[PDB]
Design a protein around this nucleic acid. Structure first.
Ligand SMILES: Nc1ncnc2c1ncn2[C@@H]1O[C@H](COP(=O)(O)OP(=O)(O)O)[C@@H](O)[C@H]1O
Ligand SMILES: Nc1ncnc2c1ncn2[C@@H]1O[C@H](COP(=O)(O)OP(=O)(O)O)[C@@H](O)[C@H]1O
Ligand SMILES: Nc1ncnc2c1ncn2[C@@H]1O[C@H](COP(=O)(O)OP(=O)(O)O)[C@@H](O)[C@H]1O
Ligand SMILES: Nc1ncnc2c1ncn2[C@@H]1O[C@H](COP(=O)(O)OP(=O)(O)O)[C@@H](O)[C@H]1O
Ligand SMILES: Nc1ncnc2c1ncn2[C@@H]1O[C@H](COP(=O)(O)OP(=O)(O)O)[C@@H](O)[C@H]1O
Ligand SMILES: Nc1ncnc2c1ncn2[C@@H]1O[C@H](COP(=O)(O)OP(=O)(O)O)[C@@H](O)[C@H]1O
Ligand SMILES: [Cl-]
Ligand SMILES: [Cl-]
Ligand SMILES: [Mg+2]
Ligand SMILES: [Mg+2]
Ligand SMILES: [Mg+2]
Ligand SMILES: [Mg+2]
Ligand SMILES: [Mg+2]
Lengths: 270, 270, 270, 270, 270, 274
DNA sequence: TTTTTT
C-alpha cells in the first residue's frame, strides 16, 4: 500500500551484510511485521526479481567496497573481522620455538605485504609435521586470502583466484610444483604484470599478489631452482610438534594475528 | 473480478511445502475450483513466469528456514515429517545382524550430527549385498539430506548441494572417488570451511555437513589413503542380505528412524 | 473484443495432450478457423512466447499428473492407451523361442516394476539379431518409457529423462557405456534416489527408475564389471529373430503387452 | 490503421517458406516499398524481436507440417517441389554403369524409406571419384534431408538435425566416423527411437530417420566393425565416374528422382 | 515527440557498414553532436539493448544481402568496391614469373568460382617467400572472403565463417592442418553442402564455399593425403620474391583483380 | 505530481563511468552510489527499482565506447593519447642510457621501432634475447605499459583463447618465450608475423578477422641462431642483452617509467615518422 | 544455456 522501494531493501540487506538471496528473501519477509517497505515487498508481483537484484547489488558493493582498500586499509578491515581472544605472543612463541627470530619474519613480512619485487614469495620449508601448513593457513585465513589447489594445475584455471585475493597460498609444493613455478610463474615473482584467465570471462591483466608456500623441499638448496633462489624468502621450521598423545597442538587463530598486526602496526610500515 | 496475488500463491505453496514447479502449477490449478486467487492465476498471461517464481520464492524460504535450525531443531522437525509405524528395533536388529554393537554406532552418530572435526564422515564398507546402501539411504532419506552424484564432480559442482543439505551421502565410493576426497575435500573432513563454488556470480565458503559413504573399498586398509584413516569412521557390513527368495526382508523406514531418534534422543546428546 | 486467453490455449493443449511447441503452435493455428481464441492468438504480437509458455505449462501438468500415480495405476493407464489386437502368447512364444521359462521373466519383471533396489535393471544380452532391441523397445514403448542416449553423456543433461519416465532403456551398451555405468551410475542401476539436472529447471532428487539394457556384452561374465554383478539381471538371447522370411516371425506390440499385463496382473503383484 | 501486424509477417514469411532470420528480415525490408505492414515493421523499435520470433513461428509450422506427414505423403510432397525435366533412366543408367541391378537398389530403398530396424542404413562404398556423394547428395536433396558434419561431433548438438529431417546423410565417413557410429549410434543406424539434444530446448525422443553414408571404407569387410554388419547395408560403386571432359558424365537432379519415384511408386510399396 | 527512432540508427549503421556493437555504439554517440536521433539515443535508458539490436539487425541485412547474389552478381558488386588504379598484367606478370600459363590458372578459377564439387579447392604450395599468401590474400580480400585460423580448430566453431563468406582461405596449412582436412572436411573441400555450427545461434546447412590454401607441403605428393588428391588443385609457386633491398617486386591490389575479372569476364564463364 | 527534473538519466551514469574509465560492474555500482552524496543522478540511481540492470548496462556501454575509442585512433593519435596519460617526471635519457649500457646504438632501436609501430610486414615482431637478469622483461613491460599494450601468458596457450587480447590492444607482449613457445609461433602465428589477417576467437562471441598488432618478445633463446626456426629469422628483429642490469642490494640502476617513454616519444616523434 | 572448460 506504500509502493515498495528497492533501494531501501538493498540498504537493509547491505546493512545486515545479507548477501545471499535465500536469506535476504526470508529475513526481509520476517521484518514484514514491522516494516512498511518489506510489507510492500511481499505485495510485489515480482519478489523473485527483487531478491535476486537485491543480492546482486549487495555483493556488488561488498566486493567493490573491498577492492577499494589499500593493503593497510584491507588488513585494517580484516582486523575488525577477527573475533575472539588471543595474543601475538602465541605467534612469537611458535617462531621462537622453531628457533626463528620474530624480527626475521617481521622484516620478511613487511616487504611481502608490500609486494616488493623478488620479495613477494614466502616459503616455509621443513620436515613433515613442523607447523608449516599451520601458520600459513592461519595467516591466509586471517588475511582472507585464497588457497591454491595445485592438483587442478593440469588446468590453467587453477590460478583464477589470483585475480581477486590479496594473498594466495600453495600448500605443500612438490618438485612438480616448484618446477611449475620456476617455469611459468616467474613474473608472479618479479612483480611484472601477468595474465590470468577467468572461467567464461576475458583474461585479466594484474600484478600477482603475495604468495605463501609450504614445502618439504628446500628450493634454496636444489640447484635446478636457481632462478627461485633470489625470489623466495625461506624460513626453515625443523622442530616437530604434533606428538602421539592426541593432545591439541599449537593453533594460531584470527585473534592472535589480530594482536600481531595491531601491536606491530608501527614496525610493519603500515 | 479479482487480481491475481502472487504472494498468496507463494504462501499456499509454502504451506504445502510444494517446492517444484511441476507440482505447484498442477496442484494449484486444482484448487482453482474453490479458490479465487488460483482462479485468478489461471487467468494470467504469465502463469509460467509465476509458477517459476512461485517455486523460486518457496525454496528460498525453505532453504533459509532449513539452514536456520540447529541440528536438533532440524532432526526434531524431520521426525514430525516421519509418518507410518515402525520401531527402532528394526535398526538395532540389523546392526546386530551385521555383528555390531548399537552403542558403537550411536556414539559415532553423536559426534557426526555435531559435525565435530574428523568425525564428520561415516562410512559403511563391505562386500556386495550387505545392506550398506539402504541403511545409508534410509538414514539420509529420514534426515532429508541430499545424494551427491560423483558423476559430475569435475569442476566440483558436485558440491553445490553441500551449501544446502544438513547431510549428504556418497553412495558407492570408488577408488577414483576416495582419491577425490583425499585430494580436494580434506577440509570437509577437518572442519575448516570448504570453498563451495557454484554457478552464478557468487561462491560461498560454506561448512561441509556430515557425510555418509558406502563403499566396497576399505580406505582404512589401503595405504595411499593415509590422510583419511583418522578422518573417516568405518563401520563394516560383512554379513549378506542377499536372502530374498519369498519373504520380502529388511528395509529401514522413516518411521524406524523416528523411533530410533525419539528413544535415543537422550543418549545422542541432542 | 477478442483478447487472447492464454489459460484457454493451455487447456486446449492439455486436452489433446499436445506438449511440444512445434505442434501446439501449428495445430492451434489450424483451429483458428473455428475458434475465437486461436484466432485471437494469431492476433497476438507475441505468439512465440505463448506457444513456448503454453507448452511449458502443459508439460508442467502432465508431469505432475504422471508422477502422481502408482506403478499399477500407471501401467493400468498405459493399458487404456494400448489399442489394437494381439496377445500375451506372442510374448510367451518369443521367450520360449529364446529358451527361457516365462516364470523366470515374470518373477524378474515383478520386482523390476516395483523398483526394488538392485533388482531394478534387466539386461538382454546376446549375439546380434536375437530380438533384444526388438523386445526391449516394445516393452518400453508400451510403458511409455524414455531412451537415454549415451552419446550425450558428455552433457550432464543427458539423464534428464530420468526425472520424468517410469522406465528407461539403454539400447546396445558398448564397453565404454558399461564402463560408465559401473563407474558412476551404480546408485542408478540400483534404483536409489539420484540427483537429476534439467535445463531451465532446478536439480531434482528422484528415485532412478527401472532400467532396460540390451548389449553384446555379458557384464555377468566379464570380471571388469565385477561390481555390476549384484545389480544387473540378465536374460540371454541366443536364437535368431529374422532369417530369410519376409517379415520378422516376432514383433511384439502394445497390444501384446496389454494382454500380458492384463492376464498376468495378479502374478506381477500389481 | 497503421499498426505493425506480426501475424501478417509470419503469414508472408510462411508463404515464401522463409525460415531463417537473416532472410526474413532482409526480404521483408525489401517488400517495404509496396507493403504497409513491412513499412510498419521497419518503424518498430523491436524489429529484432520480430524477425527472430517470426522465424521461430514459421519453422514451427514447417516442422509440424512435416512430422505430421507420412513417407508416402512426404515423398509425394517432395515431388511437387521437383521442377525441371529429367527421367528415371538417368538413375538407372548410372546404377547399371556401376554394375548393379535396379531391382536390388529398389528392394533396399523400399525397406529403407520404411525405416525398418537395422535396415535403416545404406552405405555407398568405393574408391574415390566413383559418384557416391554425387548420388547420395542428389537423393538427399530431393528428399530435402539434412547433412551431418562429423567435424562437429565434439558437440552432442551435431545430431540435432535427426530430430527434424526424414533423412540424414553422412558424406565421406572415415574410420574415426565409423568408430563413433559403432560405439554410440547403433541405436540410430538401427532406425530405432533415439533422444536428440537441441540447443536451449530439452532432448527430443524420436525415431532416428534413414541414413545414407558414402565411404572409402567397406565396413562390411573390416572386422572391428563387426557389430556394424547387421545394421548396415552396402553398395559398391567400383567403376570410375568422372571423365576428362570438364562436364562429368553423371549428374542426377531432383527431376530425375521425381520420375524415379513417380514411375516406381508401386514397387516401392508407397 | 522526437522519441529515438530505431530504424534510423539501423539505416545509419547499415550505410556505414558498421556491424559490431562496440563501434556502432561509439561511432553514433559521436554523431550525437549533429544528430537529433543520436542525441535521442543517448537519452534512451536502454542504449545497450539498442546497440545490440542495431548490430543484429545490420548483420542480418549484411549476410542476407550477400548470400542473396549469384557468384557473377557477387563478383560484379565486389568490383564496384574496388577503388584505385591497377591492371591484370600486374597479376599476370607474377603468374608468368612463377612459370605458369595464365590460362592454366584461369581455367581452374572459372570452375572454382562456380564451386563445382571437387574443384572447389585450390592450393598454392611452394618454398617460403614465393608470393603464395601474397596472391591468395589479395584475391580473398578483393572477393571479400574470410580467412580461417587453424589455431582454433580445437573448437569446431572455427568454421563458423564458412556459413557467411563466398570464399575462405586457410593460410599456411601444416601437416596437422592437412590431416584435419583429410579427416573431417572432405565434404567441404568438395564444395558440397555441409552443417556449420554457430555459437549460441542455430546450425546452418549450406554449401561449403570455395577454398584457397597456401602451404609448404605438396599434398598431391605425400601419400597419407591420398584422399585429398581428388579434391585439391595444386600450384607450384617456386620462384623466390623480395630479392635485394627489401622492395617488393610484386604488389597485387583490388584494382588489379578488378581489371583481371573485368577483362576476363568472358573466359571465366561469368 | 508532475515534471521530474531529478529523474535518473542513464547516459549521465555512463558518461561518468566512462570519464573515470570504470568498466567493471562491481566498481561502477559502488563508486557511483558513493558519489550519491553530492550527485542528483547518483541519488536518482539509488532510487531506481532496477539498479542491477543499469550497473550492468552502464558497464556494457562503457566498454563498447572504450574498446571502440582505441581501435579508433591511428598509431600516431593513439601514442599521442598514451602520452597525456603518462604522469610523473622522467626523461628519454633514461632509455638511452640503458640501451647504451647494453651496447646498442639507440638509433638501431629507433630505426626498428619506427617500423614496428607501423606494423610493417616481417618487421612486426621485436625480440629481446639474452641471459637472465639483463633487463629484457624490464624494458619490454615498461614499453608495453606505456603503450597500454596487453601481455599474453603462454601459460594458457592450451586454449586457443589465449590470443583473445590480440583483437583489442595495439601491442602485445609474450614475456619469456620458451622453446615450446617459439615452436608455437613458428607453427601457428606465422601470419601474426607477416601482417596478413588472422582470425582471433573471443569467448562466447563470434571470432574476429583482425590484423595482428605489433609484437614484443623476450627470451633466453636466440631464434636467430637456432636452425629449427628458419621462417622466423626474417620476421623477428633481434636485440641481444648481454650486460647484467643486476642490482646487488636495494638500489636499482635501471627502472623505466611512462614518463621516460613520454620524453622518448615526444623528443623522437620526428624520427619515428609519427 | 551453450560455450567453456574438462
Ligand atoms: N588443516 C589443518 N588444521 C589444523 N591445523 C593444521 C592443519 N594443517 C596444518 N596444521 C598445523 O601445522 C602443523 C603441521 O604442519 P605440517 O602439516 O606437518 O606441514 P607438512 O604438511 O608439510 O608436513 C601442526 O602442528 C598443525 O597444528
Ligand atoms: N526398498 C527396498 N525394498 C525391498 N528390499 C530392499 C530395499 N532396499 C534394499 N533391499 C534389499 O537389500 C539388498 C540390497 O542391499 P544393498 O543396498 O545393495 O547393500 P549394498 O549397498 O552394500 O550393495 C537388495 O537385494 C534388496 O533385496
Ligand atoms: N518393428 C519391426 N518391423 C519389422 N521388422 C523388425 C522390427 N523390429 C525388428 N525387426 C527385425 O528384427 C531384426 C532386428 O533384431 P535386433 O533388434 O537388432 O536384435 P538385437 O537388438 O539383439 O540386435 C531386424 O533384422 C528386423 O528385420
Ligand atoms: N553438381 C555437379 N555438377 C557438375 N559436376 C559434378 C557435380 N557433382 C559432382 N560432379 C562431378 O562428379 C565428380 C565427383 O564424383 P564423387 O562425388 O567424388 O564420387 P564420390 O563422392 O564417391 O568420391 C567430380 O569430378 C565432378 O566433376
Ligand atoms: N600487398 C603487398 N604489397 C607489397 N608487397 C607485398 C604484398 N604482399 C606480399 N608482398 C611481398 O611478398 C613477400 C612475401 O611473400 P610471402 O607472403 O612470404 O609468400 P608466402 O606467404 O608463401 O610465405 C614480401 O617480402 C613482400 O614484400
Ligand atoms: N621498473 C623497475 N624499477 C626499478 N628496478 C627495476 C625495474 N625493472 C627491473 N628492475 C631491476 O632489474 C631486475 C630485473 O631484471 P629482469 O627484468 O629480470 O631482466 P630480464 O627481463 O632480461 O630477466 C630487478 O632485480 C630490478 O631490481
Ligand atoms: Cl557394494
Ligand atoms: Cl546386438
Ligand atoms: Mg550398494
Ligand atoms: Mg540391437
Ligand atoms: Mg565423396
Ligand atoms: Mg605466408
Ligand atoms: Mg624476465
Amino acid at each position: 500500500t506504500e509502493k515498495f522501494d528497492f533501494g531501501t531493501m538493498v540498504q537493509w540487506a547491505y546493512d545486515h551484510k545479507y548477501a545471499e538471496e535465500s536469506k535476504i528473501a526470508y529475513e526481509y519477509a520476517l521484518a514484514a511485521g514491522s516494516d512498511s517497505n518489506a510489507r510492500a515487498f511481499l505485495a510485489t508481483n515480482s519478489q523473485a526479481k527483487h531478491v535476486k537484484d537485491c543480492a546482486t547489488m549487495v555483493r556488488h558493493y561488498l566486493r567493490a567496497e573491498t577492492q577499494a582498500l589499500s593493503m593497510p586499509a584491507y588488513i585494517k578491515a580484516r582486523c575488525k573481522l577477527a573475533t575472539g581472544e588471543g595474543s601475538w605472543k602465541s605467534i612469537l612463541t611458535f617462531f621462537n620455538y622453531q628457533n626463528i627470530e620474530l624480527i626475521t619474519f617481521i622484516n620478511a613480512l613487511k616487504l611481502w605485504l608490500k609486494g616488493i619485487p623478488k620479495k613477494n614469495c614466502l616459503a616455509f620449508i621443513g620436515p613433515p609435521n613442523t607447523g608449516k601448513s599451520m601458520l600459513c593457513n592461519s595467516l591466509i585465513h586471517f588475511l582472507g586470502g585464497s588457497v591454491l589447489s595445485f592438483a587442478n594445475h593440469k588446468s590453467h584455471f587453477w590460478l583464477a583466484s589470483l585475480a581477486d585475493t590479496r594473498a594466495a597460498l600453495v600448500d605443500d609444493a612438490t618438485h612438480a610444483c616448484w618446477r611449475y613455478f620456476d617455469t611459468y610463474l616467474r613474473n608472479a615473482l618479479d612483480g611484472y604484470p601477468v595474465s590470468i584467465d577467468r572461467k567464461h570471462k576475458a583474461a585479466v591483466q594484474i600484478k600477482a599478489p603475495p604468495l605463501l608456500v609450504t614445502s618439504n623441499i628446500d628450493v634454496q638448496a636444489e640447484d635446478r631452482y636457481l632462478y627461485l633462489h633470489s625470489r623466495v624468502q625461506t624460513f626453515r621450521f625443523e622442530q616437530p610438534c604434533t606428538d602421539e598423545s592426541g593432545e591439541q597442538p599449537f593453533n594460531i587463530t584470527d585473534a592472535d594475528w589480530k594482536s600481531f598486526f595491531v601491536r606491530l602496526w608501527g614496525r610493519l610500515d603500515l
